[PDB]
């Protein structure tokens, strides 16, 4: 009913603001779109669950995230995919470490602001 879609909408607004901060922090847009298989032909032979921020925006517009944890899973999937494919000497691996640091600095307050919608 109205009250349930209102709740889902206010929760999506909190997840969106967090995704936009992650997209903004990713200035080189390393994680904005799926990794280009024409540039990296062996990528999907190594990464079994590719993830990127644009896919997360689509899940959001479809109201696919029903808990904070489901959102976090996708952020940490992007990060752990980057560690799995790339060597630790590369700019990609360093940028994943940087966004993991940024995310870990934010998530406690955003996660609380999310639970507080249905308080």
């Amino acid at each position: 009913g109205y009250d349930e879609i209102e709740e889902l909408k206010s929760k999506n607004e909190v997840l969106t603001n967090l995704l936009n901060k992650l997209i903004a922090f990713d200035k080189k847009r390393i994680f904005l779109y799926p990794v280009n298989v024409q540039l990296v032909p062996d990528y999907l032979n190594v990464i079994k669950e590719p993830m990127d921020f644009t896919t997360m925006k689509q899940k959001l517009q479809n109201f696919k995230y029903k808990s904070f944890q489901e959102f976090e899973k996708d952020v940490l999937l992007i990060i752990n995919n980057c560690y799995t494919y790339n060597d630790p000497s590369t700019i990609y691996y360093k940028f994943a470490e940087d966004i993991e640091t940024y995310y870990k600095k934010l998530n406690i307050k955003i996660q609380t602001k999310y639970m507080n919608i249905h308080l």
């Binding site: 540039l39 990296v40 062996d42 990528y43 190594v46 799995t84 494919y85 790339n86 060597d87 590369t90 700019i91 990609y92």
Partner: peptide, 5 residues
């Protein structure tokens, strides 16, 4: 992985 750059 092979590598990107």
């Amino acid at each position: 992985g092979r590598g990107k750059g």
